Design a protein around this ligand. Structure first.
Ligand SMILES: CC(C)CCC[C@@H](C)[C@H]1CC[C@H]2[C@@H]3CC=C4C[C@@H](OC(=O)CCC(=O)O)CC[C@]4(C)[C@H]3CC[C@]12C
Ligand SMILES: CC(C)CCC[C@@H](C)[C@H]1CC[C@H]2[C@@H]3CC=C4C[C@@H](OC(=O)CCC(=O)O)CC[C@]4(C)[C@H]3CC[C@]12C
Lengths: 393, 393
C-alpha cells in the first residue's frame, strides 16, 4: 500500500532543507571560520550525531531493499504486522534530526546573539534528541520508540533475559557504532573538568599540564568504553550457549569477541609502556601485530562463511557463492566481498588508534576520516546477514 | 488518479530549497547589502519575474479547487480529457523558477566570480525562462508549453481569430499582469539607452539629475504598453459583438474596457505636463480622479452582478447569493466580496501617501507593495468565475 503524499512531501522537504544547510555550512566553514582557533572538539562532539543520522538513512535503505527483495523480515524480527515502518518514515526521521543537527552546528559557528558564547548548543541538541527518544506522550511514532526502548532495556541487561534475533542484531549494530559512545565519554569529561564553565569566550588554546585529560587513559576511563559492546555480545553468546547447550557456534563466538578484548587491553598496555618508556616496549609492539592478525583473520572467516553463508560446497554455477540467492546480480556479492576485507582492517585500525592514544597529531584525523566507513560496512553486512537468516528458516 | 510519489518528492524538495533560499536571501539583504547605490532599478529588473512565479503557484491552488469543488473545468477549457496537468506539476514548475530567481538574485547580491561582474545574471535568468518556454525538444511538458505558446499567439492576434473560453480567460489574466510588461520595457530601456556597459558592477549613485530617462513617460512609451492588454480585450469584445449580433452583454464590456484608455491617457498627460508648468494641471487631475471612480465602479458592478452572478433579485434562503452553490462556506463568499471591494478601490489608499508625504521615492514603494495584490484578486476571482461558468454551461 503506497504511503500518503504528505509523507513523501515531508521527506522531500527535509531532504532539500538538509542539502541547502549542508552547502551553506560548508561555505561558512571555508570562508567565515578562522584556522587559528582549534576546532577539533567541535568535530569530536558532532561526529556521534552525524553517525546517527547516517545510520538512520542507511537503515531506511536496508528496509527498502528487504521489502523489494522479497525477504519476510517482519516475521524474522517478530514485529507486529499491523504497525510497521517503511523506508519513508525512517527517511523523514533522519532528515528532521539532520536538520536539527545542521541548525545546531550553524548556530555554534556563527553564534548570532547570546550572553553564553557557544557551549549550550551541543547540549541543547543532544537533550532534544534524548527527549524525543523518551517522550512520555503518545505521538511521533510512540509504538516504535516504546519498542526500541524495551529492546535497549533487554540488551543492556543481557545476561539475564533470553536472547532473541533483535537483541543480537542491535548488539552488533551498537558494536559498529561505538564511536558515539566514545564521543559521549569525551564530551562528559571535557564538560566536567576541562572547560571553564564559570568564564566567557569558551574554547582557548591549552598550555597547562592538566590539559587533555580525556586524551589520556587515566586508569580505565578509556578502554572499557571501547570494549563495552564486545562485553555485551560476549555475555549474550555465553547466555545463549547456556540456554541451548550447543558447543560449536557459541564457543567459537566467545573467542571471536574476546579477540578484540585482548587487542584492546594489549593496546592499553602498549600505551602505558610508552608512558613508562620500557626497553621491551618495542617487543610489546610485535605481539600487538600478532593479535591484530588473529583479530581480523578471525572475523573475516566469520563474515563470509557463517554470517553471510558463502563458500558453500554446493555452489555449482554460482562461483564462490551459495546455491540459492534472491538478489538479481552477483556483482553486488563480489563487490561486497572485495570491500569487506578492505574495510575490516581500517575498522580495527581505527578502534586501536582511538583508545591507544597513538598518533598524537594524525590519530584524530585518521579516526575522523575512517569513522563513516564502518557504518557503511555494517550497512553492507545487513543485507546478506538477513538474506542468509531468511533462507535458513 | 493519484500522482506518482516521485512528483510529490520533487515538489517537496523544491519547496524546501525555495524556503531556505528565501530566508538566506532576506538575511543577506538585511546584512550583506550596502546602501550607497540606488537599488531601485534592481527591483524593476526582478519584481516582474517574481510576480510570474507567484502567479504560477496561485494557479496551482486554483485547479485543486476545481478538482474538489466539482467544478468541471477540463470540459469547458477544451482540454484533453485523458491528459491533464495536476497542481503538483504547477507547484514544482513554480518552485524550479523560484529557485532560479533566488540563485540569480543571490549571485547579483554577492558577485562571487570577478569576471562577469553584474549584468549577465538577469539576462541569463530571463533567457533561461525564454528557452524553457520555446524549447523545441519533446521534454519537460511538451504538450503544456506547446498549448501555451499556441494560445499566446492566438491571444496576441485578437482581432482576427475566433473567440473562445481559454482565449478571453488568458486575456483577463494578462489584464492583471501588465506590471511584467512595464518592468520588461524598463529593463530594455535601461540596458539600451543609459547603462554604461564598459563598467564593472557600476557602483555609481544615481542621485545625479541626469538620471530618470526611462523612469518618466516622456515621449509616451509606457502608456501604450500599459494599455496593450486593455486594447486586446477591447478588440476581442468588439469581435464578440460583431459575431453575436447582440449588444446586451458586449458593448457595455467594451465601454468598461475603454474607460481605462481615458484613465491612462489622462494620467500620462498629467505626468508629462507636471514639469512643463501647465498651471491648469488640477483640471486634468480632477478628470483623472473622476474617471478613476467611474472605472473602479464599472468594474465593481461588472464583477459582482454579472461576472459572478451575485446579488440576484430572487435569492431565497441564501441572502445576497445565488441559488445553487458548490463551495460550503458562505463566509468565503462574503470575504471575497469584501476583499474585492477593498482591492478594486485600493488605488485611493496609495494616492493618499502620494498626496500627503514628502518622502523621496514614494510612488515606487507603494507600487511594488501593491503589485502582488492584483494577482491575488484575480486568483480569488477565478474560483467564482469558473463556478458560474460551470453552472451556466
Ligand atoms: C567500495 C566499493 C569497492 C564497493 C561498494 C559496494 C556497494 C556500493 C554495493 C555492495 C552491496 C550493494 C547492495 C547489494 C544489494 C542491494 C539490494 C537491491 O535491491 C533490489 O532492488 C533488488 C530486488 C529487485 O529489484 O528484484 C538494491 C541495491 C543494493 C542495496 C546494493 C547497493 C550497492 C551495494 C551497497
Ligand atoms: C486576506 C483577506 C483580505 C481575506 C481574503 C479571502 C481569502 C482568504 C479567501 C476568499 C475565497 C477563499 C477560497 C474560496 C473557496 C475555497 C475552496 C475550498 O475547497 C476545498 O479544497 C475544501 C472543500 C472540502 O474539502 O469540503 C478550499 C478553500 C478555498 C480555496 C478558499 C480559500 C480562502 C479564500 C481564498
Amino acid at each position: 500500500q503506497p504511503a500518503p503524499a504528505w509523507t513523501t512531501f515531508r521527506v522531500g522537504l527535509f531532504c532539500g532543507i538538509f542539502i541547502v544547510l549542508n552547502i551553506t555550512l560548508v561555505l561558512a566553514a571555508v570562508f567565515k571560520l578562522e584556522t587559528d582557533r582549534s576546532i577539533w572538539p567541535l568535530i569530536r562532539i558532532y561526529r556521534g550525531g552525524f553517525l546517527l543520522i547516517e545510520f538512520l538513512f542507511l537503515l531506511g535503505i536496508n528496509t527498502y531493499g528487504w521489502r523489494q527483495a522479497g525477504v519476510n523480515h517482519v516475521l524474522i524480527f517478530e514485529l507486529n504486522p499491523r504497525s510497521n515502518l517503511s523506508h519513508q518514515h525512517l527517511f523523514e526521521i533522519a532528515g528532521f534530526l539532520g536538520i536539527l543537527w545542521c541548525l545546531s552546528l550553524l548556530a555554534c559557528f556563527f553564534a548570532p546573539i547570546s550572553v553564553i558564547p557557544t557551549y549550550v548548543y551541543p547540549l541543547a541538541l543532544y537533550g532534544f534528541m534524548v527527549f524525543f527518544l523518551i517522550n512520555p506522550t503518545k505521538t511521533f511514532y510512540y509504538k516504535s520508540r516504546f519498542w526500541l526502548l524495551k529492546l535497549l532495556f533487554r540488551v543492556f541487561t543481557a545476561p539475564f533475559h533470553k536472547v532473541g534475533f533483535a537483541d543480537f542484531w542491535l548488539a552488533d549494530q551498537l558494536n559498529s557504532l561505538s564511536v558515539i559512545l566514545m564521543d559521549l565519554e569525551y564530551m562528559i569529561c571535557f564538560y566536567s573538568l576541562e572547560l571553564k564553565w564559570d568564564e566567557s569566550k569558551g574554547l582557548l588554546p591549552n598550555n597547562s599540564e592538566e590539559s587533555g585529560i580525556c586524551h589520556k587513559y587515566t586508569y580505565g576511563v578509556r578502554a572499557i568504553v571501547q570494549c563495552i559492546p564486545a562485553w555485551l555480545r560476549f555475555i549474550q553468546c555465553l547466555r545463549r550457549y547456556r540456554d541451548t547447550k550447543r558447543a560449536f557456534p557459541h564457543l567459537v563466538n566467545a573467542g571471536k569477541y574476546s579477540t578484540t578484548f585482548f587487542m584492546v587491553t594489549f593496546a592499553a598496555l602498549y600505551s602505558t609502556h610508552k608512558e613508562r618508556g620500557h626497553s621491551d616496549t618495542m617487543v610489546f609492539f610485535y605481539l600487538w601485530i600478532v593479535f591484530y592478525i588473529i583479530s581480523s583473520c578471525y572475523t573475516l572467516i566469520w563474515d563470509l562463511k557463517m554470517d553471510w553463508g558463502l563458500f558453500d560446497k554446493n555452489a555449482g554455477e554460482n562461483t564462490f557463492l551459495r546455491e540459492e540467492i534472491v538478489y538479481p546480480q552477483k556483482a553486488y556479492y563480489y563487490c561486497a566481498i572485495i570491500e569487506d576485507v578492505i574495510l575490516r582492517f581500517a575498522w580495527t585500525i581505527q578502534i586501536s588508534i582511538t583508545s591507544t592514544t597513538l598518533l598524537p597529531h594524525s590519530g584524530d584525523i585518521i579516526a575522523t576520516v575512517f569513522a563513516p566507513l564502518e557504518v557503511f560496512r555494517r550497512f553492507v553486512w545487513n543485507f546478506f546477514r538477513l538474506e542468509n537468516e531468511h533462507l535458513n528458516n
